[PDB]
């Protein structure tokens, strides 16, 4: 094959092009030994509460302002083309 390909930043398994690692022990269990639906509700509720309390206003402010100007624009546009608006 060969063909002398170019330069990338991914590689493949075995040589992923990353810095050399040392002294990183990792443990994991088997899917048949662990239990799904264990601590899901508690952790999910805590994460959702933290995310709502943390991000929050970032979304709350622009959407609220946009909705307010939407309502005001609809009301004013309906008023102006009515009888009393044109006068």
């Amino acid at each position: 094959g060969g063909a002398a390909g170019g330069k990338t930043y991914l590689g493949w398994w075995g040589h992923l092009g990353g810095p050399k690692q040392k002294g990183i022990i990792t443990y994991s269990l088997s899917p048949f030994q662990q239990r799904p639906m264990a601590g899901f509700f508690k952790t999910s509720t805590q994460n959702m509460f933290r995310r709502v309390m943390t991000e929050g206003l970032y979304v709350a402010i622009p959407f609220g302002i946009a909705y307010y100007i939407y309502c005001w624009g609809k009301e004013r546009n309906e008023f102006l083309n009515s009888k009393h608006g044109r006068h």
Binding site: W13, G14, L16, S30, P31, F32
Partner: protein, 57 residues
């Protein structure tokens, strides 16, 4: 155990006993692995386990 007893116990073994033991112990059962060194190319647990049970049969 005397060598006569060992010979008798080994003689009883047939291919069907091997098949039964391999089906009740090896065929699609949990494994415990342990790796040391440069193991970047060693895939994760589920992909490793998937190879212990052939799908053709």
């Amino acid at each position: 155990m005397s060598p006569q007893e060992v010979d008798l116990r080994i003689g009883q073994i047939t291919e069907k006993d091997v098949a039964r033991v391999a089906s009740e112990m090896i065929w699609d059962k949990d494994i415990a692995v342990s790796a040391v060194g440069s193991i970047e190319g060693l895939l994760d647990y589920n992909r490793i386990r998937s190879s212990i049970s052939m799908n053709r049969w």
